[PDB]
Design a binder for this molecule. Structure first.
Ligand SMILES: [Ca+2]
Ligand SMILES: [Ca+2]
Lengths: 218, 152, 51, 15
């Protein structure tokens, strides 16, 4: 086998250290797989209740003759709400890497769950993608604030809605959980000229192949 | 037999509480390294009182073509950019709800922090033309960071 | 190693100067990496209240 | 789509 561990790198490339210099040194043993383990952790959640509040005032003057005069005032206040689009959800998340390899262009998919049902399944679009994620690191980095998971659209234009029942049970003891279902990223290889290419190199092509030829240790 | 003459004038003001305001940040990019970055597109968090309002990636309106070391985009004598939209096609404004607008009508300020920057480097192709398209700087960031010492 | 500093340019490209002419002189030493450090700073912020 | 509205009114008429 050219790739004993089942990873994108051959036995010679691993043993000779001729790979991405961000790979942990243990993963340059032909028996240990270069393998990123990325997870997402929510830090808090923000609810934007989209009700339409209204208010208006008024004044009236009138004069009648058969002499009679009148003057009056008025003020009204209203509140409207859509029951299928009752609020918007914003989760602040952060990616961790506890593997042996860096992942490029990290794109996690996450379920948002509330009381035994998945409200949304979001895949990270442009605003939420992390360019680099080295092992034993996070995105965003340690001294920075977490991301904002605002949108469910492919183009980052549609906010994440919840209806009226979920909104009512959300203003109670119930909490929203976040769970990562999968993460897609890239690995680096050098092409003809010594340039690192991380675009046609999908990690998911190897996940199910590394998980079937190896034992797991944590 | 009767007559009448009436007159009235109303005035109203409505608001949405999930789209209570729009935010426009004026930003500028800096470069303190040894190499220029082409097609600079940063990613920024807008933080208000311990919670992130939005994470915005630079789209076409806010991308800087050249950024030489020790220089800024825009240049020194120009006014800062407008970080105005949040979607891919620069057609969706950055919203804030009613509670954030109320606390923002106080001493609370919005902080901006760069979470990453992506750009291109330049190489000469087969014929001697400089190419800066498939040459992503973010392929070398971790590798340079892992084999070096940092000095400021 | 062809790239001692780990940047996209080789030892010979850097030492020989046959790289981007906008790279600092510092970074044509094979031990100093050509590496941009970009940061964003906010000048002011504007709020459009859509009543 | 649900809506709830409230309102007040004062007046004065002299003959
Ligand atoms: Ca072998
Ligand atoms: Ca060498």
């Amino acid at each position: 086998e050219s790739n004993t561990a089942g990873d994108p790198y051959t036995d010679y490339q691993k043993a000779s250290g001729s790979i991405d210099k961000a790979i942990k040194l243990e993963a340059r043993d032909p028996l240990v797989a270069a393998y990123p383990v990325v997870g997402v952790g929510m830090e808090n959640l923000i609810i934007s209740t989209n009700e339409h509040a209204s208010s208006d005032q008024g004044k009236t003057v009138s004069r009648a003759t058969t002499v009679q005069d009148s003057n009056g005032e008025s003020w009204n206040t209203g509140l409207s709400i859509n029951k299928g689009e009752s609020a918007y959800i914003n989760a602040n998340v952060r990616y961790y890497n506890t593997g042996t390899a860096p992942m490029y262009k990290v794109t996690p998919t996450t379920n948002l769950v509330l009381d035994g049902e998945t409200l949304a399944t979001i895949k990270a679009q442009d605003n939420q993608i992390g360019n680099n994620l080295s092992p034993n690191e996070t995105y965003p980095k340690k001294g920075l604030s977490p991301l904002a998971l605002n949108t469910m659209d492919q183009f980052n234009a549609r906010l994440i809605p919840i209806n009226y029942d979920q909104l009512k049970k959300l203003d109670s003891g119930k909490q929203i959980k976040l769970e990562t279902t999968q993460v897609s990223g890239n690995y680096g290889t050098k092409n003809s000229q010594g340039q690192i290419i991380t675009e046609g190199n999908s990690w998911s092509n190897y996940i199910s192949q590394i998980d079937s030829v190896s034992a797991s240790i944590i």
